[PDB]
Amino acid sequence: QTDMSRKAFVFPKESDTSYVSLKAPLTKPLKAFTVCLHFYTELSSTRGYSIFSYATKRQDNEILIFWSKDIGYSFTVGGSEILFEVPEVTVAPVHICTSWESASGIVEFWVDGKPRVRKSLKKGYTVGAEASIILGQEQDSFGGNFEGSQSLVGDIGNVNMWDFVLSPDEINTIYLGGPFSPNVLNWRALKYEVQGEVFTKPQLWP
Amino acid sequence: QTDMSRKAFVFPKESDTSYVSLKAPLTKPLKAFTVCLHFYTELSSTRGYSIFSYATKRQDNEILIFWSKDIGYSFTVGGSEILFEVPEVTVAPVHICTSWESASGIVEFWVDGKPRVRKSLKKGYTVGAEASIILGQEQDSFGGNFEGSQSLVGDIGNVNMWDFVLSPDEINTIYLGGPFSPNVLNWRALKYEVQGEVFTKPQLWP
Amino acid sequence: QTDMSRKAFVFPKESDTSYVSLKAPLTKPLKAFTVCLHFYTELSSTRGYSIFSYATKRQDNEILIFWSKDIGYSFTVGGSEILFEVPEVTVAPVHICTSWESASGIVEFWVDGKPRVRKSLKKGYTVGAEASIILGQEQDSFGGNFEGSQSLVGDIGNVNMWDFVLSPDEINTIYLGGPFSPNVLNWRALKYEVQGEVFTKPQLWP
Amino acid sequence: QTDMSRKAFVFPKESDTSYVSLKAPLTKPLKAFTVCLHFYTELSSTRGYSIFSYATKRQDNEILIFWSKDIGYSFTVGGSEILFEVPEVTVAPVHICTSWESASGIVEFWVDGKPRVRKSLKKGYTVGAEASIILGQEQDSFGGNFEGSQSLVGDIGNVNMWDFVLSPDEINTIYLGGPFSPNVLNWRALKYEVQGEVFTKPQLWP
Amino acid sequence: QTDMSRKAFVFPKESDTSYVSLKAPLTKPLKAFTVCLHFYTELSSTRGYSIFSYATKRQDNEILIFWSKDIGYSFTVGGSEILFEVPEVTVAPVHICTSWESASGIVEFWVDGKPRVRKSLKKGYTVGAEASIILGQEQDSFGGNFEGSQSLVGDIGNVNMWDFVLSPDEINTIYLGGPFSPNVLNWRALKYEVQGEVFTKPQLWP
Ligand SMILES: [Ca+2]
Ligand SMILES: [Ca+2]
Ligand SMILES: [Ca+2]
Ligand SMILES: [Ca+2]
Ligand SMILES: [Ca+2]
Ligand SMILES: [Ca+2]
Ligand SMILES: [Ca+2]
Ligand SMILES: [Ca+2]
Ligand SMILES: [Ca+2]
Ligand SMILES: [Ca+2]
């Protein structure tokens, strides 16, 4: 397990082979989660890209956080989708926290510490635990079948995952980088594998 | 009596059956009131919605606080209406306080602690006490006949009602959430009934 | 004499009969003056309106402070006009101080503590003492012949008048509401008569 | 010698006769200078105007600081011109400092404490001591031949002149109005001659 | 060695012959570098210009930092180019730091302390040390063959070079002008030769 603190993964070249795979010590299926990650790319005005792809043997978009050009953030669970329209994107690092609860279907999406309105998605579903988690690519099979036009170019870091919906107060401490304990996927205790042109570098964001 | 402090009602999906009814322990008719409530929705650019709807068996728009698409806030009492035109809408939680006095007919409308110009509506009228208060819908009968195109999608909370016009200073302490005592409808002592797809969740706003 | 501190006159409907008349104990004619007042209205994009009208039996526009739509402020003394162009105007309460000196004819106009450039008007003129001062209407005869399209809708207060040009430092004190001593017309010691639909209410501005 | 501190010259009418002449106790020609001044006018969007005219028997534009409509500031020495483009202009008092060095021909222009890029003008030239310094007008003969379309309307003050290029640090203390010692033309100790409609008034800028 | 602290080179005319050449003690070739500098010019809207130009007898664009009109910054190493698009640009001094590493090919570009996204360029290349470094011009032969349409006009200073990629934290102390030790090219210990119309003056930026 590596402390990746103060570091980011860098995807400096457009490739369909470059990705990192994150491994979860996960067993019980997720009835709810929060995923938070900090990323930086200039593609936002150019094309869509996959921020965070979680896949299962049955479902290649089991969780996907996707920037879709001109639309904004696409958040999709169990192959279903909602949009959080973004009117004008800015060339700066962006922190996102997004969380989903099966009991209510409530999705929260938080961008740079400000909440988007809660939306309903896929009420009562369960996210499978037998998961392939990938950064840098969108996977259309379990751990594979990437597309070059969907790769992330730029940096991703602070990828942390919880099996419960963080409260707004908790999410604020994440955004301020207070101390917190991710119990599904922990940037301070990460397990990962690297393929292709990918690098570990000091994080550009504070 | 429930303390709803730091909690909001969430209407996550458009429907004509999800609503909350609020119960007022009210005997005398109102010669004046202040309604304050804090709400959050992204519908504003898209369609109209009922923020707060007070009805009586003789009048289905006895008090209505309504967002009119492209217009702004519509405030109407006793079936008559005035507009507080809003030039451009931010996508953020908004706190409104509206107050009406029969003796003068003066309407005060306050948005995020800044006053709109005072306007005249229904001088000498009186609002009935035997009333249905509903959040999330506009009611065209004494407690029913909603319309899906008028349902609120998003969050509402801190709904407080007084049987008198708050001074500007008092309204400022509401907006800052200083201590205050609502004597018609109190968020810290609320009595309510939930119907349909409505959830109680931590408030997104501070 | 009434302390009107913290209070404003409210003109909540368009009418040609709602006005207040202010009484000045003047005897000696004015060679110079400053008038300061704080007002709030939403008419500014809609139509022109009289802010402050001082009339004498020979001259209905002996002093007029007038908002001319798309123009901005019209300041007129002795029936003669100068324009302080305002290109776009915020929907907020506005403090104005305007000072005129016969000896030089210099007009200073101050809006929310910022000076406009000094302009010349009616060098050597003198404003008569035996005067009718009216708020909310434009006098086309000595104390009468109002026009509905020229009435103020909204609030006016802190109306203070001096028979001398305040220095810029003094005017900055007025803008901050420090202690000051108006020696022609004093909000803290006002003499007035109310006519028609007009109300006295807590001031909305700080 | 008069202390003009906290005072400005006011040119309230457009005219070709109102000007003030400033007397320099100047006995050695200038190989370099700094001139700094505060002025305030609304002409900027309307027409060109003479901010500071320094003339000699040999040349009527020995130094000229001139606002030229839609262009911005024209700075000219020895009859030759450079422009400092100002794309959009604000209705506020403006402080300028401008300093020229013969040895390098470097012109520094500073507006409200921010430097414009250094530019070259009249390297090796020598500005004459036999000087007519005029405020409010552009003099096209030695102390005369004004043009009404070129007069300043508004205020000018704190005119200070040095026979050397101030460092950026010194310029910053002028902009903040720290204590300083002008050794050519001193507002603390000015010698001046007023002609026509010009007034001395308290300064409007801080 | 000269301490050039608080000082800048000034290029006040467009010319072919105005340049300065900088010398390095360097002998071992650069597998990586950081170059940081302050420059100030008004050309950005008008034409392209060379900010920093490092050449070797094999390659006249061995490192080039170039402003290309409407593009923004062009960063080129070994004759190969990448763009950091700048959407809109304004007349202020600008601090840039640019760092390249052969092992990864990662380019960092920092403008006024904010990072641009890391990009890939000329992975595994090696930059020769037997080098001509020139400010003010772009050299298309080893120390020669400039073009007037590519000269810098305005100021350049604080030119510091390291043979390693500064961390983000180190680059932040450069931007704040903390103490630091450039081990290739040091503004506090500079060796240089001046040709043509060039001057040394107090820096305009803080
Ligand atoms: Ca997929
Ligand atoms: Ca795909
Ligand atoms: Ca109704
Ligand atoms: Ca309805
Ligand atoms: Ca009149
Ligand atoms: Ca009239
Ligand atoms: Ca001339
Ligand atoms: Ca002329
Ligand atoms: Ca070249
Ligand atoms: Ca070239």
Author numbering:
A (entry chain C), B (entry chain B), C (entry chain A), D (entry chain E), E (entry chain D): 1 to 206
The authors write:
Maps corresponding to pentameric CRP were solved with both C1 (no symmetry applied) and C5 symmetry. In all cases, applying C5 symmetry yielded maps of better resolution, corresponding to 3.2 – 3.3 Å. Structural analysis of pentamers strongly suggests that pentameric CRP adopts C5 symmetry in solution. Within the structures obtained by cryoEM, five intersubunit ionic bonds contribute to monomer-monomer interactions within the pentamer. These bonds form an ionic zipper from the A-face to the B-face of CRP. One of the salt bridges, Lys123–Glu197, is present at pH 7.5 but absent at pH 5. In agreement with our cryoEM data, Lys123–Glu197 in all crystal structures was shorter than pentameric CRP at pH 5, with an average bond length of 3.0 Å compared to 6.0 Å.
C-reactive protein (CRP) is a pentameric protein of 115 kDa composed of five identical non-covalently associated pentraxin domains. The B-face binds to a range of ligands, with the canonical example being phosphocholine (PCh) head groups in lipids such as phosphatidylcholine. This is a calcium-dependent interaction, with each CRP monomer chelating two adjacent Ca2+ ions. The A-face modulates many effector functions of CRP, such as activation of the classical complement pathway, where binding of complement component C1q to CRP is mediated via predominantly electrostatic interactions between the Ca2+-containing globular head domain of C1q (gC1q) and the A-face of CRP.
